[PDB]
Amino acid sequence: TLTRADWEQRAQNLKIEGRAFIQGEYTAAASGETFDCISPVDGRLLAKVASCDAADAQRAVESARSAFDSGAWSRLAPAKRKATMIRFAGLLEQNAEELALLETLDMGKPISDSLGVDIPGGARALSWSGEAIDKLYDEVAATPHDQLGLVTREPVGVVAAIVPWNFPLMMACWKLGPALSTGNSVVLKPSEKSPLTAIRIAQLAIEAGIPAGVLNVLPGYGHTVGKALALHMDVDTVVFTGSTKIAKQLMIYAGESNMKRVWLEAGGKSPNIVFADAPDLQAAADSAASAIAFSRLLVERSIKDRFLPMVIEALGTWKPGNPLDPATNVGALVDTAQEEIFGPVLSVLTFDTAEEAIQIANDTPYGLAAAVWTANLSKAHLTARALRAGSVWVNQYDGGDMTAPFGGFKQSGNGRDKSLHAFDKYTELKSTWIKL
Amino acid sequence: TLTRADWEQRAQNLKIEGRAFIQGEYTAAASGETFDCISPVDGRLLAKVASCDAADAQRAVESARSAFDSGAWSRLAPAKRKATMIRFAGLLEQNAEELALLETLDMGKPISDSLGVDIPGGARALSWSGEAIDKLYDEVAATPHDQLGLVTREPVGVVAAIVPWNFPLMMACWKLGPALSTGNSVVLKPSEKSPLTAIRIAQLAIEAGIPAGVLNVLPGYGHTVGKALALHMDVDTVVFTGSTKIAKQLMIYAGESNMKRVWLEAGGKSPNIVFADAPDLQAAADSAASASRLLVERSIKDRFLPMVIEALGTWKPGNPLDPATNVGALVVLSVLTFDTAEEAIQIANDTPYGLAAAVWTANLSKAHLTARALRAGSVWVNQYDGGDMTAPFGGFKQSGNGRDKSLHAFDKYTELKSTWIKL
Amino acid sequence: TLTRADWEQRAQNLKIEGRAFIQGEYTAAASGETFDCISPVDGRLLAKVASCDAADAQRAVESARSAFDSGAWSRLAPAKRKATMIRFAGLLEQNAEELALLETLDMGKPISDSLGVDIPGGARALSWSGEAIDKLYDEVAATPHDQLGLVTREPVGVVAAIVPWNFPLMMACWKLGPALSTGNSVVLKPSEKSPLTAIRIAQLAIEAGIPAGVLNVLPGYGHTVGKALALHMDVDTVVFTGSTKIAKQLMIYAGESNMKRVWLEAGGKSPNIVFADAPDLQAAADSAASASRLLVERSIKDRFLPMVIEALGTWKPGNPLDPATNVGALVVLSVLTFDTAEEAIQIANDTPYGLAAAVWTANLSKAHLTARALRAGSVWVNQYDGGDMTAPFGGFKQSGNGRDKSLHAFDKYTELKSTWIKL
Amino acid sequence: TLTRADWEQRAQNLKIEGRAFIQGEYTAAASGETFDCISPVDGRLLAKVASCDAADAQRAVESARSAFDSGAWSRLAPAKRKATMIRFAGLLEQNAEELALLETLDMGKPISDSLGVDIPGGARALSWSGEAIDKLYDEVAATPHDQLGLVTREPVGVVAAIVPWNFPLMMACWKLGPALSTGNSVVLKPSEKSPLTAIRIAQLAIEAGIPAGVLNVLPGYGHTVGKALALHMDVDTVVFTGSTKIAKQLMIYAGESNMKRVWLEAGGKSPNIVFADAPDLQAAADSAASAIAFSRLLVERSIKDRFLPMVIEALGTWKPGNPLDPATNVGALVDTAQEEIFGPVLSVLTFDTAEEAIQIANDTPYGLAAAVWTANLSKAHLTARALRAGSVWVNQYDGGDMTAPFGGFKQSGNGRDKSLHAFDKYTELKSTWIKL
């Protein structure tokens, strides 16, 4: 296992690619302009990264459209797209230490999380999506005997994927896995705060067998190249994760341009409901402490006095550190009777009944996730069912396989990352009704 | 079988309701204002219809939300929502002659179409969606043995349904069937050119057992009450059929308001692609004549175009109240030639739209490969305007997003939830 | 609401049909023989019922096969088979008082159960399966672009349905609903102890629009006409509910004849596992009393056993024609103690059978983990005899194979086909 | 590419395992008895193979039951069973040349078919089944609000898989893939004519991570150990491919013992319907010739004179040869107006209408497969639909991905190998109805 000094040496010895990627080749932005990618670990200059704009969006989309029309990927046999997507995931694992280090240097994530969670989780989304391709079935309708009615799914064509900086590679792979597996061409626009891993995997896709033009990567700013993609008249679908404010802007851009499909995932405050009969109060307390560090806590009154000190002590475990130290669990970054505030940073809502907890938890713009802690069978299922959240966790927190659609109710977003339902965002339904 | 004179007598003897419907009662608009519902058959004044605005949108949405939160419909057992939807459909059928006559007087559709197609088709959309409710299953994920992973569907809450004048009742039922069946409250906003059947069925829904506030109906103009629903901060989903220009405006209104989900069916074309080996050229000709772009293989064009010209002659405008009329009186077809299936596909797909297409060929490969290559939500092969309730209907590209009919229509009215339970 | 005297008057005034039904007509058995259908209520002779044998099996199967090959039902549009099945169910409901009375006279079931549970439950099985028909989709495989891969379901052809006397009509409808709805012809063989309702509904099927020959009914003995259907070389599938011993014999008969598919629901037990934290001990006690093995957690056993003894007293035998009767007059519960959920599971699973089980606990993990570990086709948690038409019913191990009710019941009556089309 | 001489040398240099495999170890039969596995290539003695009987069935089933009850495989997380099953497939590919050579020596299959079709096809069934495990979903019923209704699938427990000698490894993998992926323990009984590859992969399963006891292999005779498994009172399910006569016997054995589930796949004569408007008459003729060599031919009258000589010439291409020669396409083995017979070996039925063709093709005990050749859209779909066969091929022959359920109508069998439907044979449905 690598020490902090090993990672420091590896960091110094990286050669970091900063260019955009279009039609199988790294390329500067048409303007030649760049922005400084500055590490939050120690302020070092990681790379001068291409600052793409509308001219680059245009070239990336032309490349994407032409590749989609060629059929090189969009009409490739499903079992061969499966194999390619699994090789793609394998190349992420084969380059895991470099990718984890790029991620940590780019935006400060602890090297243990980059290497232990994000990069394997990104690989897993690519390979799971590939595995699923030829396990999917479309539909034959119940029709009279002189009719054959097919209901099939087809790729939308050109997909723009705009992702934030919190899980740069893993969020990108959650879009890329299903979007590529269904046969679309993808123009990926990583956050200006974390472009490096997206830039790096562009080349691994080619290595895996993804044809030129099928995955283009445009680093740069949201207000320049992101807006240009959202407004582009030949982009069929934009998928977005990020802030509610930008999510709303994309609907506006869609309406102002070509009525493209828009799928949104927008954070929102996620409640944590702890009942007095939770089976493992220490687990609930660890959960609550985790959410304050790298959420809205609701606690039953009969357990509040006992429970809050456990949250406080558990919070002590989270300590900033150098992200290059494997022991660090929080990145120490550098410049580039119902409601109470208990400590400096402990905000707590108290309830007496489950109905109170549900009404307070649902009193929100919503609503990406929620956790419920109770040993009682009826209260667990009825509370989970009453919460307006795309993900509800019961007696655990942040649980969820690749078999888990991740998304929100209302201003938290629309559509769902992950699962077989993830594919639906990237395909169109067609009805073929054949007279025999 | 009723004669024209029978229908003119029934038309004269109708009492026509014009009010909005909120929380189980017909009501004037808050302002007291109305607009004149004028028959394109006659010029006769059918009714003074409530001209709702933002204040009525507010009351309809508050009513819808409180009905949703009450669970009276949203948490009613699936089998009981099935029975109510089926009774609702039975009440359209039981009142079919009055509803077809309202439809024909309201916007000029021939009475034989209103009675024979639209009212039965709208009733069928309600009963079929009702029948489906308790046949749907959600999902149990494959998980480790100490986990239960459930992926379920839940109603979004309050649905605004905005529909045009071309198929007032049936297009409304295409929305209402799946939207109500999944437990939502619906605020229905019919076109200003055809509000009457939507107003009338609001009372039939109550008679069937739909609770007060679950189906509210707001007649009025698109730019007043329609805009106010698209912009409303407590409407979870808007579903729409109509023009591309308005469909785009709804996305903008959603972004300006609460990020509500927007499902659009916009304008589209139904091009016919007629190959020389079409099994029944007369059927292809009738299809082209019921209308726009006609793609014709060069070798049969000389023989085929006279067939469509003759068929175009069978459509005679007449009095919409005459059972013999097939086009209502009231108050250019482009020929492209091709030599290969590849050209026909490229020509057909050269469009911002993509709603439907019909393909005519007796060849196995050509039929399936051409249907695959067309960017249309519906492809009909060796027939036109085909499909029933099992066939989802909608558009690629700027013809909209989402699908009406089939089990997939339900998806637009529900939200996915993943519940991960540690055991 | 009818009184006992009302029911005794209706029982006296019935005219009871006793003939077999083949190709749209009631008929004597080929031999002319009958057996005496004696009421366990009274000893009264209800009817002299046709005693069919191998020759009648032959004629019923020839009729079924020719009806199947004609396509009159097997190739009728799914929506038309839906409407007929729903009308068929409506005819059971329209004749519910006569059918419940036949059921009660035939095998002694209390009239309030016959009228209140069995006839509605049988009708519901017919209408629910009918409603499902056109909501089912087959599959399009993921294939290269020059291939179309279809995986579809087709009716097996001729189905023999053999049912016992405990729920004559409803168990018959559990078979008929899915078997007819998928387009098969069915030869129904009711128990010799309860042939009357099956005989009677054969005419209702025709009245609903089921074609002649699609539903044939052969009363008689298991060892004559039943054996002859199990051994018949042109019966594609036999479905059965009854004893383990006969269920095993049917597999043998299938192997001795034409390798027909065999679907069995055999004997099973409904053990109750009552934990100390059960949310409602009285409900658990009533469950145990409606009866066999009772697993009880040691700490509540002293308090719980008096509750089941008291509840056992509420079951009083009486005249089956008395609406107040809950056990028909006509003509040992084993207590196991456990300390942990692991013992309770091991005790419960220590059985050759595995049809059903009920588990009583308010604990989330314990409920789900115990239900997972039980080898039973149905597990009820904090209720007993639960589930509706959406819940498949059947057994693990020697309680049989396959499931009645739910969309999965359809699988037993269809065959999969893969069609791989080169384009 | 290896020459015939390379294969001859490899054949001589093999060390061939002949023992049975129970509870993670090779073992002789309890009796110590063996039978001679004699190569049909040149009569050489390949190995003395354990001749298992009822005592061995009993020990294998006890091992299988105990392993299933332990949960080591049956309650292993689905994503981990996926990984193990994919490693299993990888070990087949890693040992492909040895496995292909064992198959060719064991029963005479051409070495090019063993190496090019059977071994990769067997690996593909194992890995596809593993890929599918965590893409499967059970069901949540539509219930009143105070009810949770689950409809789930569970492994049956102990599965006996009895396979013939025609595709010894590939047929075994068609059962093993889904049976193991769903978590059952499997007792595999290969044909007495081809036991070697089944014996050899038993060890590769352990290497892959399949726990001891989960896959036991019992070589020996049908009338001894096969019957003992079919009669065993603790086997939950027998799956069988082979002759109609033995298929019927297994139903009898099931009824005489414990009412175990029986799933059968029994050959039957498969028709080949050639219409005058077939798009590629040469392809249809190659198809018909292939079926006579390593079926029932139906030909439209208006094309018969033109078509039959193409069949005859195409049949000339199939020539027996030494199975160890890569050029060989047929193993040359050694001892261990409607109906016409045209040549020595060309039986042909002539029809005038599609209805005639359908009625003649369906006039059968059935009915495993069928092929239709016509360019006409309506006739293709309507004929395919009218045929009573588990597999219908249109304008091709023996087509079919792993996404293809393979099985028969009526005396051709019940249930279907391959596809997602393949899993249903190996699981039980349970309904859990929870009052809330």
Residue numbers in the entry:
A (entry chain A), D (entry chain A): 3 to 296, 306 to 347, 398 to 497
B (entry chain B), C (entry chain B): 3 to 293, 306 to 345, 406 to 497
Publication passage describing the model:
Here, we demonstrate that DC3000 produces IAA and identify an indole-3-acetaldehyde dehydrogenase, AldA, that catalyzes the NAD-dependent formation of IAA from indole-3-acetaldehyde (IAAld). The AldA monomer adopts a canonical aldehyde dehydrogenase fold, which contains an NAD+-binding domain with a Rossmann-fold motif of a central β-sheet (β10-β9-β8-β11-β12) surrounded by α-helices, a mixed α/β domain with the catalytic cysteine residue (Cys302), and an oligomerization domain with a protruding β-sheet (β6-β7-β23). In each structure, two AldA monomers were in the asymmetric unit and packed to form a dimer, which then form a tetramer by crystallographic symmetry. Overall, the biochemical and structural data presented here indicate that in P. syringae strain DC3000 AldA functions as an IAAld dehydrogenase in IAA biosynthesis.
Comparison of the AldA crystal structures suggests that ligand binding results in structural changes that order the active site. Likewise, a ~50 amino acid region of the catalytic domain (residues 348–397; α13-β15-β16-α15-β17-β19) is disordered in the apoenzyme structure and displays elevated B-factors in ligand bound structures. In the reaction sequence catalyzed by AldA, substrate binding leads to conformational changes that order the active site for catalysis.
